[PDB]
RNA sequence: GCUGUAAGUAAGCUUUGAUCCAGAGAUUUCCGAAUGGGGAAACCCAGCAUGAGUUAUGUCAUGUUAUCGAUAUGUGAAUACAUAGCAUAUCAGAAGGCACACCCGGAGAACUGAAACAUCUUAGUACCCGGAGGAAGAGAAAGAAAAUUCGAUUCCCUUAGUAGCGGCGAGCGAAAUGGGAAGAGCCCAAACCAACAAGCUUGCUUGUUGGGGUUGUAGGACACUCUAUACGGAGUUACAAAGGACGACAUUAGACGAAUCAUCUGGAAAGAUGAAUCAAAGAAGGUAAUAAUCCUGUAGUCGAAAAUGUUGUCUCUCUUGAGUGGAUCCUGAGUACGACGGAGCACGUGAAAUUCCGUCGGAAUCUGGGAGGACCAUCUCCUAAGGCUAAAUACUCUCUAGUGACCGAUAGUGAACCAGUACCGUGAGGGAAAGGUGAAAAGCACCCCGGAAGGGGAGUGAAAUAGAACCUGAAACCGUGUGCUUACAAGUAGUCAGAGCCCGUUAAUGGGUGAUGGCGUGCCUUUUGUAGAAUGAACCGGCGAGUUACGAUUUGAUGCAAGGUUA
RNA sequence: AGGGUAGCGGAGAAAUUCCAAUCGAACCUGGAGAUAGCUGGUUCUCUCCGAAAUAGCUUUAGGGCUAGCCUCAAGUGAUGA
RNA sequence: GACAAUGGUAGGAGAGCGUUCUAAGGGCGUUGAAGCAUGAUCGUAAGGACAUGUGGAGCGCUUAGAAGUGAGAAUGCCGGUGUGAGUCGCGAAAGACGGGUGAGAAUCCCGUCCACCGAUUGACUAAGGUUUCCAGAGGAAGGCUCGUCCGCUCUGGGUUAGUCGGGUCCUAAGCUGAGGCCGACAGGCGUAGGCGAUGGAUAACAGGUUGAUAUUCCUGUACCACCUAUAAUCGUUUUAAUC
RNA sequence: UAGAUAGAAAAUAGGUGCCCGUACCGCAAACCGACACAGGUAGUCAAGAUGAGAAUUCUAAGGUGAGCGAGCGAACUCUCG
RNA sequence: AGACUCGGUGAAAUCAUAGUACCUGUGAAGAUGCAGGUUACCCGCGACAGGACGGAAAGACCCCGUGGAGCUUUACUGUAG
């Protein structure tokens, strides 16, 4: 439900980090974001592409802090905890 | 975001709202009841009309073409009449399929039990056939019963394994009174009238509609008195007559949907440590390890353009309802009943009622007839010989939502995976084995030997002795090395004693080996008795055999007590 | 080569021979977990007690029933040896 | 503290251990669960703890309840592994040499010789099987050895008809069979007609050609039916030409 | 012949001509026989010398060398002289 | 030709554990496994075949079963016709 906005990945390899997302993959439920870099290899010794994680993620717009995203009233449109700006 | 499982590549689509979800609609090749003919199922061959293309034939497109019946036609003649037949047209008719379930009907067995068996039982079960339903059957008293009588049917309890049937053996087995679930009663036939009809006896009667009328405490007709009036009404489309309008509710896609931060460990926290929060939501599952406060979610609330289903009110239809009197008529005929053979009723021919079947005989008409377990009498009750009928009930191929002191890959569906498959058989038919990498594919770049395969290295990853025949990885079985020991030796193979050599524990009367001596004929089963040359086991792993309901009986406990107890 | 007859049956130059490698009555499914007085098998330890192989009847003698002989819990109460 | 008993099958009575699950309570667990393995330990027994290694996520304990509750033996079912055994066999048969290939050849290709069948181990078709056919690669298993090869795998590719066998022609045996006769239902019989060839009738030959097709392709030469176009014969639509 | 129907077409030119099957083995390695199995598997052609002859012996056409072999040359079994 | 040695490939019915003598005796009354004596260094390979009451086939003979089928008849009871 996300198309390249901000997040804070909290509960994975290394946390406290943020970044912006690529394909959400609705079926596998796995998003692509800067924060994991597999050492893939083809015939280079390594490749350093970008890999995915399950949704252990959260958004942050006004508080500059993770909150439970909360799609609220119809004006649909997002309406977060403390502040209500677009997703 | 998408182009299924099923990767991958390339081409492309998508806020001008894809894909996806739900409802309607359009298409829906061929076989198959198969239906134009034929046919080895999925092929072939035609016909007629119309219409494509040819100069023209060949060739094609669409439509149409079976049988049966049941209506309307014409036509029919072996015989003149006119029927049998014949050609044509109409029908949303039927045929078939199935859920091996539940129901009714036709037909209908044997092993077995009886300690054998023929009566009998199993059983009126199985399978077969047929029909219909979503439920069926039954059904509104020619009952039950014996009183302060009740007044369709069905099912559950109970009466009762009682009364009874029975080579009186096996065994079989009610019904009623009573307590409950559901509760519903109605139309014909007939005598009477009108109409039309052939015989018109110019007598009226039969033939067809409409009325008319539906019963035991007798009723209707017929005669008479009032109600109603084309309606005051009851209507009730689930019987009772068969048609149609218009609101509410549920279903088939969905949405909202409160709440948490940090330190340590970690590859990774959802854990420990602390301090905080929501609760109509601490159900559940997933999330790199065990989460109410990360996601999906739940409590609760909202929501349907269209379609369906059930319900409601006006339309809608359709309808007279009682009473008396009973002069005269009517109350279901080759029926009821009897005998003869049989079946079925719990009931085997028994004294055997009551009900059905076949042959044959053969009643009555309300001052009538049937029953009340042979049969007659009195008494009591009911009125066949015509028909319809919801619910209560039985089952679940299937769907929705749920659940389990149910299984967790030799269990459980046979089937967790590409299974009614491979396979076997001519064929009916029978029938397999086979789950798991990791959190994520990050699925081993690169070097080296090698023809390859395979491997050693290097790297991804916490771990690759997790590397695809990939979690864990036992035992059999096979090896490699090694401490001790073994080449004059008669061995169910061990045990007891014990020197020598070596080693040091879940640290105690230690452990490994064992020159030599004493002693000693496996295990179960079955047996008068077995080393047994009587049987079975090749080894090891798994699997695998006194269970459950109902009832009787006793034992122990427990509660009550001349009372106790519920279905 | 194409066809027929099908098991309470058929066909048989007849032997109880053939009927999809089987025939003193084929084959598959269902009744059906048929029946068996017969054989075989019956899973984890200890403690206490402890037999019989006889009588009778049995279309019975390798089975059964009753009495004997055992065990357990009550009762009797010195009756037993 | 004394006294006495304590072998034991069928079998009777009694007390007991552990597994799976449930309920409740209380606890353990990445600072490594379960299981597994090793061990010189506890208990009278069935059995249970402990330490260590491997293992990588759930488990114990007390009380009680319900059980698909225990397996050495069924000529038991299934699975795996041996024993026999590197033992019998390797499925009639005459091959040898050279040269190539290849990582590697008694077995593969090439040739020369030799031997064998020859009313045939030859050539052609039917039934039958279903792509085995041909080319190019490959050798994991199959081939009763080896294999650089195949009828095995992978990729690609191959079957041409107016005259041929057959259908649009016929029919027996037999099968089906409108109406119809019969039967408890099912269904059984059977006329009309219809299907059904191994038979009857039916218009074609020779050569060439591909790694793989041949009366099918081309090359030449022929035939039957049919339509269209064209004319030398007909003359009531009779009869005559004519169907 | 009943019947159709105005009234042909000699030989000429031109064209039109459907479905199935067709590969391969087919006394075999490919069919039935569970096997790349010493079995069966209808039919057609079937040459040469010798011979009555499709018999027999040896050869054409053409096809094959049989899917384990090398040693030694004992028992024993089998096949032949 | 097989067997036999070497190379290649590589099964099976069976199988309680085994380091598996003989005699005379005992014994379920015919012993590798017991008692008493006797002889025998450990391990092979090729041959024979007395024993392993050897294997294979839950004895085809005999008997039992209140087992079963087929068949006969002036056995019973019934029946189609
Ligand atoms: Mg219809
Ligand atoms: Mg009678
Ligand atoms: Mg009668
Ligand atoms: Mg398992
Ligand atoms: Mg035992
Ligand atoms: Mg004896
Ligand atoms: Mg004969
Ligand atoms: Mg049985
Ligand atoms: Mg007794
Ligand atoms: Mg075992
Ligand atoms: Mg050579
Ligand atoms: Mg063919
Ligand atoms: Mg052959
Ligand atoms: Mg000759
Ligand atoms: Mg050898
Ligand atoms: O059985
Ligand atoms: O059985
Ligand atoms: O049985």
Technique behind this structure?
cryo-EM
Torsion of CA A65, A62, A59, A22, to 10 degrees: -130
- How many whole angstroms from A73 Cα to the centroid of ligand 1? 56
CB A39 within 8 A of CB A46: yes
Calculate the angstrom distance between C1' of B412 and CA of A69.
45
Distance from the first to the final alpha carbon of chain A: 9
Q: Breaks in chain A follow which residues, C to N over 2.5 Å?
A: 43, 75
* Nearest nt (C1') from A49 Cα: B442
CB A48 within 8 A of CB A36: no
CB A87 within 8 A of CB A2: yes
CA A66 to chain CA mean position, Å:
11
Resolution (A): 3.8
Neighbours of A33 (CB within 10 A): 20
Residue A71, C-beta contacts closer than 8 angstroms, at least 6 positions apart: A77, A78, A79
Neighbours of A57 (CB within 10 A): 21
- How many whole angstroms from A31 Cα to the centroid of ligand 18? 66
Neighbours of A16 (CB within 10 A): 7
- How many whole angstroms from A66 Cα to the centroid of ligand 8? 73
CB A72 within 8 A of CB A85: no
């Amino acid at each position: 439900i996300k198309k390249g906005d901000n997040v804070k990945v909290i509960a994975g390899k290394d946390k406290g980090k943020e970044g912006k997302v690529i394909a959400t993959l609705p079926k596998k439920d796995r998003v692509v974001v800067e924060g994991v870099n597999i050492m893939k290899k083809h015939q280079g010794g390594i490749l350093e592409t970008e890999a995915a994680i399950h949704v252990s993620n959260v958004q942050l717009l006004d508080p500059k802090t993770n909150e439970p995203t909360r799609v609220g009233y119809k004006f649909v449109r997002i309406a977060k905890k403390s502040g209500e700006e677009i997703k």
